[PDB]
Amino acid sequence: GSSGSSGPPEDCVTTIVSMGFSRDQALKALRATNNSLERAVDWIFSHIDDLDAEAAMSGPSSG
């Protein structure tokens, strides 16, 4: 049980991934949602929708 400097929760990360999400996403989401679970899932779903973010080219990979 180590955790010095602030950081995102593990349980959350797990939960998300548990759903079948990318580990990076979970992390990002969290950080994107000030380390939030509920919001994360929301910030996540949003991405799934299509509205990823402001106009910005997307990497080569089919969704």
CA dihedral 10, 4, 28, 20 (to 10 degrees): -10
Domains for the chain: give ranges and CATH numbers.
1-63 (1.10.8.10)
Structural determination approach:
NMR
Ramachandran assignment for 13, one of left (phi > 0), alpha (psi -120 to 50 degrees), beta (any other): alpha
Ramachandran assignment for 10, one of left (phi > 0), alpha (psi -120 to 50 degrees), beta (any other): alpha
Helix 10-19 to helix 38-49 angle (10° resolution) is 30
Q: Is 50 exposed, middle or buried (0-12, 13-18, 19+ CB in 10 A)?
A: exposed
